[PDB]
Amino acid sequence: SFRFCLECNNMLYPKEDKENQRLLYSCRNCDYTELAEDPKVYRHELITNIGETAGIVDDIGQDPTLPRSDKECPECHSRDCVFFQSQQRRKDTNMTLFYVCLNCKKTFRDE
Amino acid sequence: IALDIEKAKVIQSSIEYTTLKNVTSATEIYYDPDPTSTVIEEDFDTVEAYFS
Amino acid sequence: TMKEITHAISSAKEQVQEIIYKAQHNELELKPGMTLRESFEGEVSRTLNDARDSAGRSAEMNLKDLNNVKQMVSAGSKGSFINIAQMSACVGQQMVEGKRIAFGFADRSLPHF
Ligand SMILES: [Zn+2]
Ligand SMILES: [Zn+2]
């Protein structure tokens, strides 16, 4: 996550002080400068799993084309649920199922 | 090597191309102005063990 | 023979169901040089092909010598084993571009599934 300038809404690029030895987020369109909280400047994931379970909506139980199972809900122990596979559509994607209860509407696995 | 499976697997491993990107999983950039110490707590023990 | 063919096809469908469950619980063996989805598709296709071959072999063994289709196939003048299998026992799996029927709709082949 990256922060924005509080006065002109531009991006806050990180900057390093030679004399003070501190990491600071500074806007290049002004003189505003705010002290950085964490040193994690950049992170790149070669193999990522985000978007696998992130594709979830709160009204997925109203879809009539989705199959319905009788798996046990971990939270409220309901007897009706709706399952589907991974929303990510790469070639390496697993065939595991995500179950959605019809009362608490949370996503849970079978393992 | 043709009638032994282990030597064949050794040859196969020695022939196949393997880059850093294959074994790498994630790369990160951190700010740390102390050459002899570090800010990260998980790796602090290992790096101080190295320096000592 | 029709009972035997029905039993063979039902056993194959149960086997395919078991393969589906194993692939959906990460218990499936991966063929080297191929992904999980490709290995699953190849194994299901192999099972269904073996099912059609077994049903056809049962049907072709049933036939008498006076059977006319058998006489034509045995003379070598017209027809083969696959024709007898498809006419009498099972048409089998339909392949488009060397793969099973794709999901032309949103995650299904027809709006009836
Ligand atoms: Zn600014
Ligand atoms: Zn529930």
Side-chain angles (χ1 to χ4, degrees), chain A residues 5 7-10 12 27-30 32:
Chain A
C5 197
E7 304 185 6
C8 61
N9 209 30
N10 285 76
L12 289 178
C27 185
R28 290 189 298 160
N29 297 114
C30 56
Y32 179 73

Side-chain angles (χ1 to χ4, degrees), chain A residues 65 85 90-91 93-97, chain C residues 23-26 35-37 40 108:
Chain A
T65 62
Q85 65 170 352
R90 316 195 325 276
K91 306 172 186 174
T93 318
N94 207 334
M95 291 178 62
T96 54
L97 294 182
Chain C
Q24 284 186 342
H25 282 37
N26 273 316
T35 45
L36 170 71
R37 190 155 271 130
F40 165 82
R108 47 182 186 171

Side-chain angles (χ1 to χ4, degrees), chain A residues 72-78 80 100-106 108:
Chain A
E72 308 300 318
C73 179
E75 294 287 340
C76 53
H77 297 276
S78 307
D80 40 67
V100 167
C101 179
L102 297 185
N103 309 90
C104 56
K105 290 92 178 177
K106 76 140 48 179
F108 55 93

Side-chain angles (χ1 to χ4, degrees), chain A residues 16-17 21-23 39-47, chain B residues 20-21 24-33 39-40:
Chain A
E16 176 259 356
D17 296 9
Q21 311 294 333
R22 283 302 101 185
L23 178 61
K40 186 190 297 296
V41 183
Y42 181 74
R43 174 192 180 96
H44 186 197
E45 279 289 337
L46 278 75
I47 294 170
Chain B
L20 179 62
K21 179 182 166 184
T24 301
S25 64
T27 180
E28 290 163 302
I29 313 174
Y30 282 172
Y31 180 76
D32 219 317
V39 180
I40 300 309

Side-chain angles (χ1 to χ4, degrees), chain C residues 92-106:
Chain C
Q93 170 65 48
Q94 306 300 303
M95 286 325 208
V96 167
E97 276 160 21
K99 337 173 57 173
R100 302 201 289 159
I101 298 304
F103 284 171
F105 285 82

Side-chain angles (χ1 to χ4, degrees), chain C residues 44-101:
Chain C
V44 170
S45 302
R46 159 208 311 173
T47 305
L48 294 176
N49 261 272
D50 294 341
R52 191 197 57 199
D53 283 351
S54 165
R57 254 183 277 110
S58 175
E60 193 271 338
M61 249 40 84
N62 180 29
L63 303 186
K64 316 183 171 60
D65 302 79
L66 55 89
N67 189 270
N68 298 304
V69 186
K70 178 152 178 195
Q71 282 177 343
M72 266 186 285
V73 167
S74 173
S77 61
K78 194 65 66 175
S80 64
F81 164 78
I82 186 62
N83 300 132
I84 297 168
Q86 293 189 313
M87 275 192 281
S88 297
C90 172
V91 176
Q93 170 65 48
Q94 306 300 303
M95 286 325 208
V96 167
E97 276 160 21
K99 337 173 57 173
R100 302 201 289 159
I101 298 304

